[PDB]
Structures are given as C-alpha cells and as structure tokens.
C-alpha cells in the first residue's frame, strides 16, 4: 500500500491540528513529504482535474488569473484537465497552459437567483463527473475562480474526500462557526456538533466522492429552497453539513486558501492559494 506515516509527518507542526479527531490528516505547510507522493501518485499515472466555474464579469476579473496560477501551481508534474465551465466561451482566455496541463471548456446557462448559482455548481459538478470526469482523472478538485495559486499545492492534497478549514475559523471553537444554525434547513448543525467550519471555495476527492459531495449538497440546497429558506452561508453551509455527516479524509489547512486580509500568522508558513482582491 502507501502508510500515513509515509508522507504524512504531524510531528513536524505541533503548533496546529494535523490529525483530526478521527486519525485522518490536515496537511500543513511541512508535514508533507510531496517527493514521496509524486513518486508515488505518478506511478499510478494518475490526472488530476479541477473544476473551475466563471460567470459573466467573473471570467474577466478573475478566471484567467486562476487558471494561469493553476497551470503554474496545481499539482507540478501530473497529468492535470482543467474543467473550466463558462456562461460565455468567447470571454473565456485561452492562455498558454504548461506541460501535463490540459483544458476543457463548457457553456453553461448563466447564473442569476442568489441561491440558483451555487446549486447549478453542484448539479453541472455532478452531471460531469458521471458524464466523463469520472474516467477522466483519478481526484478532482472544486474550487471557486475567485482564488490565485501562489505555491505548489500538490498531491499532497490529494485525497478520498478532501475538505478546505477556511481560513478566518481554523483557530475558533465550533460554537462560534457561522454553521446553519436553523433547525428547518437542511444544513441544520446544532451547537456542540461540529469539528471544523470548512470552506466551500475548495473541496475534492476521487470523483466517486465529489459527486457524492455535489449531490447531497445540491439535495440539501433543494430542499431548503422548496421550504422557502436561504442558508445562512449558502453552499457553503450545505458543504459543511456534509462533511459533519461525511468526514473528509483529508483536510487541507489555511495554507491551501488563505484570506491575506486576516494578515498572516505563524501559522501559516507558505501559502498554497490565496483569495482574490
């Protein structure tokens, strides 16, 4: 097989939570022996894809510089498929990918009802990892465009189910996340319940997983649409239910998506992705 122990060191970040309540990993900055991984993932041959969705002024504004960044940053040395879904191809920038990177594009109908948006996320997500991603590449990545890779973020991040600690809660106590709090909604997460307030702006594992993840959301979405109820933080919110309920095997710290307005402690030691301005 391939042990935690061999790539996975948490001994090397005390300071923080490497290993869930549940013995599965957060990777930080350090505790990954990437070297090992890519051997190891590469003799597998695995792809990775990512799937990236951009409406309207959002593919002008930022999906470019995400993709670039990606190219750059997403998984260096792996055979990687970018799933850029668009509202409208011609914005779309078809700049210069690197080697082991390829695209496809998509239209999609555009967004606009508040809470229509992030629930056609999750249904395309869905429809296309059954339709071809699911032969297409081994681990997928959701993530939202409004986001640029600053360092190798890898295979290290790679996982069954693989959840984002959101940058500004890490160091906060559960009963203070802004989790659904309203027992009518789908997403509803009592006080005391609980272990992290993960980011809906990444998520992935094998694409078994992430339509998985895709679907309950949406389910959840759904239902609290037709019980005349938006979430408190939308997709996010249902996202984070989810992983309640599912634990991810994986969780990648702040480092993977950290906000720079927060600053930037000790910490977070080399930031993988950050938000946009």
Same mark, same amino acid.
């Given at each position: 097989? @391939? ?6 060191? $948490? ?20 505790? +990954?022996?990437?070297?090992?991984? #890519?051997? +190891? ?8 894809? /990512?799937?990236?969705? *951009?409406?309207?002024? %959002? ?23 970018? %799933? ?8 779309? =920038? ?45 681990? @997928? ?16 991040? @790679? ?12 160091? *906060? ?12 909604? *789908?997403? %509803?997460? =009592? ?19 992430? /339509? &998985? ?13 037709? &019980?005349?109820?938006? *979430?408190?933080?939308? #997709? ?7 992983? /309640?309920? &599912?634990? $991810?095997?994986?969780?990648?710290? =702040? ?9 930037? $402690? ?12």
């Amino acid at each position: 097989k @391939l042990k935690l122990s061999d790539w996975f060191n $948490p001994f090397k970040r005390p300071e923080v939570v490497t290993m869930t309540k549940w013995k599965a990993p957060v990777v930080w900055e350090g505790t +990954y022996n990437r070297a090992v991984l #890519d051997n +190891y993932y590469a003799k597998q041959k695995i792809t990775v894809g /990512l799937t990236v969705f *951009a409406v309207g002024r %959002y593919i002008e504004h930022y999906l470019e510089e995400f993709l670039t960044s990606a190219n750059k940053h997403f998984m260096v040395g792996h055979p990687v498929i970018f %799933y850029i879904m668009v509202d409208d191809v011609s914005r779309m =920038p078809l700049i210069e990918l690197g080697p082991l990177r390829s695209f496809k594009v998509f239209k999609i109908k555009p967004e606009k009802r508040w809470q229509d948006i992030s629930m056609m996320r999750m249904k395309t997500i869905g429809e296309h990892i059954v339709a071809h991603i699911q032969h297409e590449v081994d681990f @997928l990545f959701c993530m939202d465009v409004d986001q640029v890779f600053q360092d190798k973020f890898g295979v290290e991040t @790679l996982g069954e189910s693989v959840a984002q600690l959101q940058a500004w809660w890490y160091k *906060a106590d559960p009963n203070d996340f802004t989790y659904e709090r309203r027992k009518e909604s *789908a997403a %509803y997460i =009592p006080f005391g319940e609980g272990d992290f307030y993960y980011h809906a702006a990444i998520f992935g594992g094998t694409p078994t997983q992430v /339509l &998985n993840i895709t679907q309950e959301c949406f389910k959840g979405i759904l239902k609290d649409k037709k &019980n005349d109820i938006e *979430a408190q933080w939308h #997709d996010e919110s249902h996202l984070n239910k989810y992983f /309640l309920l &599912n634990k $991810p095997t994986k969780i990648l710290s =702040p480092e993977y998506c950290w906000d720079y307005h927060i600053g930037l $402690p000790a910490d977070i030691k080399l930031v993988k992705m950050s938000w946009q301005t």
